[PDB]
Design an enzyme around this catalytic site. Structure first.
Site, short mmCIF file in Angstrom:
data_model
loop_
_atom_site.label_atom_id
_atom_site.label_comp_id
_atom_site.label_asym_id
_atom_site.label_seq_id
_atom_site.Cartn_x
_atom_site.Cartn_y
_atom_site.Cartn_z
N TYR A 1 0.87 -1.22 0.00
CA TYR A 1 0.00 0.00 0.00
C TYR A 1 0.89 1.26 0.00
CZ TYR A 1 1.47 0.72 4.94
OH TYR A 1 2.25 1.06 6.04
N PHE B 1 2.28 9.84 3.01
CA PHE B 1 2.83 9.72 4.40
C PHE B 1 3.52 8.37 4.59
CE2 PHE B 1 -1.94 8.92 4.82
CZ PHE B 1 -1.95 7.59 5.24
N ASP B 2 3.20 7.36 3.81
CA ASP B 2 3.78 6.02 4.01
C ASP B 2 3.62 5.10 2.78
OD1 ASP B 2 4.87 3.76 5.30
OD2 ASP B 2 3.03 3.33 6.46
N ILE C 1 -7.20 0.30 11.22
CA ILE C 1 -8.26 1.23 11.28
C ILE C 1 -9.51 0.69 10.60
CG2 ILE C 1 -6.74 3.36 11.54
CD1 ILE C 1 -7.04 3.73 8.54
N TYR D 1 -8.28 8.25 11.83
CA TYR D 1 -7.68 8.63 13.09
C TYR D 1 -8.44 9.79 13.85
CZ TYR D 1 -4.08 5.43 11.62
OH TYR D 1 -3.37 4.32 11.18
N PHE E 1 -5.82 5.40 0.68
CA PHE E 1 -4.84 4.42 0.44
C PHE E 1 -5.00 3.69 -0.90
CE2 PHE E 1 -2.79 3.78 4.61
CZ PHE E 1 -3.65 4.39 5.38
C1 LIG Z 1 -4.44 -0.53 19.45
O1 LIG Z 1 -5.56 -0.12 18.51
C2 LIG Z 1 -5.30 -0.37 17.15
C3 LIG Z 1 -4.19 0.63 16.72
C4 LIG Z 1 -3.87 0.55 15.11
C5 LIG Z 1 -2.89 1.67 14.80
C6 LIG Z 1 -2.69 1.88 13.26
C7 LIG Z 1 -1.45 2.87 13.18
C8 LIG Z 1 -2.37 0.56 12.48
C9 LIG Z 1 -0.94 -0.01 13.03
C10 LIG Z 1 -0.81 -1.45 12.42
O2 LIG Z 1 -1.40 -1.76 11.39
C11 LIG Z 1 -0.07 -2.41 13.34
C12 LIG Z 1 0.32 -3.67 12.54
C13 LIG Z 1 -1.19 -2.85 14.35
C14 LIG Z 1 -1.14 -2.33 15.61
C15 LIG Z 1 -0.15 -1.35 16.19
C16 LIG Z 1 -2.20 -2.77 16.66
O3 LIG Z 1 -3.24 -3.60 16.09
C17 LIG Z 1 -1.56 -3.52 17.83
O4 LIG Z 1 -2.72 -3.64 18.76
C18 LIG Z 1 -2.49 -4.06 20.06
C19 LIG Z 1 -1.09 -5.00 17.44
O5 LIG Z 1 -1.92 -5.93 17.54
C20 LIG Z 1 0.21 -5.13 16.70
C21 LIG Z 1 0.25 -6.36 15.79
C22 LIG Z 1 1.40 -5.26 17.69
C23 LIG Z 1 2.82 -5.03 17.22
C24 LIG Z 1 3.74 -5.37 18.46
C25 LIG Z 1 2.94 -3.58 16.68
C26 LIG Z 1 3.08 -3.33 15.35
C27 LIG Z 1 3.11 -1.89 14.98
C28 LIG Z 1 3.14 -1.80 13.67
C29 LIG Z 1 3.15 -0.39 13.02
C30 LIG Z 1 3.27 -0.30 11.73
C31 LIG Z 1 3.29 -1.36 10.73
C32 LIG Z 1 3.08 1.10 10.97
C33 LIG Z 1 4.31 1.45 10.37
C34 LIG Z 1 4.34 1.76 8.95
C35 LIG Z 1 5.57 2.11 8.45
C36 LIG Z 1 6.55 2.17 9.53
C37 LIG Z 1 7.91 2.48 9.29
S1 LIG Z 1 5.92 1.71 10.98
C38 LIG Z 1 2.56 2.18 11.99
C39 LIG Z 1 2.37 3.54 11.09
C40 LIG Z 1 1.86 4.64 12.06
C41 LIG Z 1 1.45 5.91 11.29
C42 LIG Z 1 0.32 5.46 10.20
C43 LIG Z 1 0.03 6.68 9.22
C44 LIG Z 1 0.90 4.40 9.32
O6 LIG Z 1 2.10 4.80 8.62
O7 LIG Z 1 1.25 3.18 10.18
C45 LIG Z 1 -0.08 3.96 8.28
O8 LIG Z 1 0.35 3.96 7.06
C46 LIG Z 1 -1.34 3.34 8.70
O9 LIG Z 1 -2.30 4.15 8.95
N1 LIG Z 1 -1.64 2.07 8.68
C47 LIG Z 1 -0.57 1.00 8.50
C48 LIG Z 1 -1.13 0.15 7.37
C49 LIG Z 1 -2.59 -0.40 7.70
C50 LIG Z 1 -3.59 0.78 7.86
C51 LIG Z 1 -2.98 1.69 8.97
C52 LIG Z 1 -3.31 1.20 10.36
O10 LIG Z 1 -4.38 0.60 10.53
O11 LIG Z 1 -2.14 1.18 11.24
C53 LIG Z 1 -5.22 0.80 14.50
C54 LIG Z 1 -6.41 -0.10 14.94
C55 LIG Z 1 -6.64 0.05 16.45
O12 LIG Z 1 -7.63 -0.97 16.93
#
Ligand SMILES: CO[C@@H]1C[C@H](C[C@@H](C)[C@@H]2CC(=O)[C@H](C)/C=C(\C)[C@@H](O)[C@@H](OC)C(=O)[C@H](C)C[C@H](C)/C=C/C=C/C=C(\C)[C@H](c3ccc(C)s3)C[C@@H]3CC[C@@H](C)[C@@](O)(O3)C(=O)C(=O)N3CCCC[C@H]3C(=O)O2)CC[C@H]1O
EC number: 5.2.1.8
Lengths: 107, 94
Positions: free
Chosen positions: A26, A36-37, A56, A82, A99
């Site tokens: 994406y 942004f990404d 989201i 958001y 997206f």
């Molecule tokens: C806790 O509530 C949940 C929060 C979640 C937050 C948005 C930002 C998600 C982040 C993710 O898709 C990740 C994989 C999922 C989560 C953080 C949560 O589900 C978390 O919940 C406890 C969890 O289960 C995960 C698996 C745990 C693990 C230890 C953490 C992984 C973090 C991964 C972060 C990643 C891949 C992203 C990066 C991209 C490029 C980088 C470099 S880092 C974060 C960045 C933050 C800023 C935003 C604009 C963005 O660029 O994503 C973005 O492009 C975005 O909006 N995304 C990522 C692509 C899918 C759509 C969207 C989104 O839903 O992000 C949204 C849904 C809510 O229910």
């Protein structure tokens, strides 16, 4: 909440099923086109599971409706993204996101 | 308290990501991640700790350098870069 417009058709019959991982590429942009990404910038596909609120609500409802190989433009209003808060430093308040996503494979 | 480093990181990353992405609480996310890194800093003391450190030590050390970059820069893009390395670890552990 989410508008889905097809860019490149998928098969029309393999859709994500409960507990599958979606493997996508994406590119996320604010409404005016500012990028942004992008997973494609990293040349590394993004994997996640639907139905568990990992992503989201625009992606949860958007990508669920896509079939393997489809590429689509998801236009997501702030309430399915958001919200009033945004994600400070990256996504402004009340932001519609656009997206470009491609559903590569289900695993 | 006996817990494998695989477990303490899977739970810790999950919790720290909830505080940061779900709650917008960066202080709480640091509070969670700092003791995990400080245990890697001390060094592995079991074979299972050693093989976890061999596979994930460098990525986790790099995620910590990005977080430290953010501390000094104030730019949230530096913390996202740390979450890309944390998520790759989390997925590999999973
Ligand atoms: C806790 O509530 C949940 C929060 C979640 C937050 C948005 C930002 C998600 C982040 C993710 O898709 C990740 C994989 C999922 C989560 C953080 C949560 O589900 C978390 O919940 C406890 C969890 O289960 C995960 C698996 C745990 C693990 C230890 C953490 C992984 C973090 C991964 C972060 C990643 C891949 C992203 C990066 C991209 C490029 C980088 C470099 S880092 C974060 C960045 C933050 C800023 C935003 C604009 C963005 O660029 O994503 C973005 O492009 C975005 O909006 N995304 C990522 C692509 C899918 C759509 C969207 C989104 O839903 O992000 C949204 C849904 C809510 O229910």
């Amino acid at each position: 909440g989410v508008q889905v417009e097809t860019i490149s058709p998928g098969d029309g019959r393999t859709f994500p099923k409960r507990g599958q991982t979606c493997v996508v590429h994406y590119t996320g942009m604010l409404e005016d086109g500012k990028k942004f990404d992008s997973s494609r910038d990293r040349n590394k596909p993004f994997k996640f599971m639907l139905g568990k609120q990992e992503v989201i609500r625009g992606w949860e409802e958007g990508v669920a409706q896509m079939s393997v190989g489809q590429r689509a433009k998801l236009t997501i209003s702030p309430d399915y993204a958001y919200g009033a808060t945004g994600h400070p430093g990256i996504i402004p308040p009340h932001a519609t996101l656009v997206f470009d996503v491609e559903l590569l494979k289900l695993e | 308290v006996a817990i494998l480093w695989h477990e303490m990181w899977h739970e810790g990353l999950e919790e720290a990501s909830r505080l940061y992405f779900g709650e917008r609480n960066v202080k709480g996310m640091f509070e969670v991640l700092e003791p995990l890194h400080a245990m890697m800093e001390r060094g592995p003391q079991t074979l299972k700790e050693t093989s976890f450190n061999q596979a994930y030590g460098r990525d986790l050390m790099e995620a910590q350098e990005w977080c430290r970059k953010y501390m000094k820069s104030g730019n949230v893009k530096d913390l996202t870069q740390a979450w890309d390395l944390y998520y790759h670890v989390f997925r590999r552990i999973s």
